[PDB]
Structure 1
C-alpha cells in the first residue's frame, strides 16, 4: 500500500486516502477511490493486498446493506466496526487470509458523536481521535500529536490534514498522487472535491 488517514474532530470524521494505484513498474491510475459507504453515516477506507482490498470492502458493504434492509435500521459505527473486526479475525486463521487494513469513520446518530475505528488485517481494533495504516502514521502522528484538539472544527481538521499530506509528500519516497478526502457527519457522507 499507501495512505489512509483518519481524523475525528468535534462533529465529524475525516478520511483521507491516496489516489495512486501502482502495479510494480507503472502507475496504472491516479484517481482511485479507496473507500466504500457501508451505511448513510458510516464510511470505510481500506489499504492492503491487490484484489483483496476491494473484495473485502464490497463484501462488508453488502452485509451492512443487507442488515439495514432486514431491520429498517442503521447499525451504530461501533456495531459495524465490531462486525468488520470479527470478519478479519476470522480471516487470519483461514486457508488464505485477506490482507486488508481499514479505517471506519462513522457518525453515531444516537449519541450525536463522530467515531473513528482503526482495524488492521489481524482484526486489531482501536477507537482513536486520529489513525493511519502502513507507514502513514510514522510521518503524520508527530504533527497530529502536537496540533490535535478534541474540539476542532471540520475546517481546522482539514487544515491539520493538509499539513500531514504535505509532510508525506515531502518525506515519502512513493508518489501517491494526492488524496481523496471525505467527511462523515450528522448529514451523512460528502467528498471534498478540491484538495
Structure 2
C-alpha cells in the first residue's frame, strides 16, 4: 500500500495510515485499515506488496498472541519489534521474500514510555520520535524536524499530523483517500473517528 506515518509524543504513539487500495487503474476501497493490534498496548501498521502485507501482519499477530497466552504476560514493544525484525531479516534471504515495511507503536507499561519502531522489509530497525515508509518521509520530515518536541501532548501530535497529511495531499500525485489515525497510550489502543 502507500502512506504510513508515525509519531511518538510525551505519553502516546500516534499512527496514521492511508485508506486507499488500488487494483489496476481502479480504486477498490477507500476505508481500508492497514493495521493490526499485536497486544493490548502494541499496534503495528504496514505497507508493501499486495497480499504479503496482511499475511505477514496476521502471522506476527498470531505469534504475539500465542506468547501472551503461554506466559500470561505482555511483551514489551522493544521485544516485539526485535521479533518482527528477525522475521523480516530471515525473510529477505528466502526464496520469495515478504515485501512489507512496518511501523510498530507501543506503550511500555513497565517504563511508562511510548515507543515507535520503524522496520523496513530488509529487517532494518530504528527507534524514532517520528517515522515513515516509502515516499511519505520526503514530504513530511521537514515539517516534523521543525515542529516536533518530545514534550508534546497527544492533541498537539494530532495537529502536527494533520499538517503532514495536508502537505501530502498538496504535493503527492497520488490520491490516498485520507488516513485512519490510531493512538496508543497507557490505557491501550483507540481510533480517532474524525480526521
TM-score bracket for the superposition, by shorter chain length: over 0.9
Q: Match of 1:151, SS? A: coil
Distance in 2 between the 1:158 and 1:99 partners? 29
Deviations 1:31-86 (A, max 9, x none): 00000000000000000000000000000000000000000000000000000000
Q: Which runs of 5+ in 1 are unaligned?
A: none
* Offset of residue 21 of structure 1: 0.2
Q: Number of residue pairs matched?
A: 195
- Residue 188 of structure 1 and its aligned partner are, at CA, apart by 0.2
- Displacement after TM superposition at 1:109 (Å): 0.1
Distance (whole Å) between structure 1 residues aligned to residue 41 and residue 76 of structure 2 = 9
The unaligned stretches of length 5 or more in structure 2 are none
What is the deviation of 1:24? 1.9
- TM-score normalised by length of structure 2: 1.00
Indicate the RMSD between aligned Cα atoms, in angstroms: 0.3
Structure 1 residue 127 displacement after superposition: 0.0
Deviation of 1:173 (Å) = 0.4
Query: When the two structures are superposed, what TM-score results if normalisation uses the length of structure 1?
Result: 1.00
Give, in whole Å, the separation in 1 of the partners of 2:148 and 2:22: 32
The offset of 1:102, in angstroms, is 0.1
Runs ≥4 in structure 1, deviation > 4 angstroms? none
What is the CA–CA distance in structure 1 between the aligned matches of 2:146 and 2:2, rounded to whole Å?
23
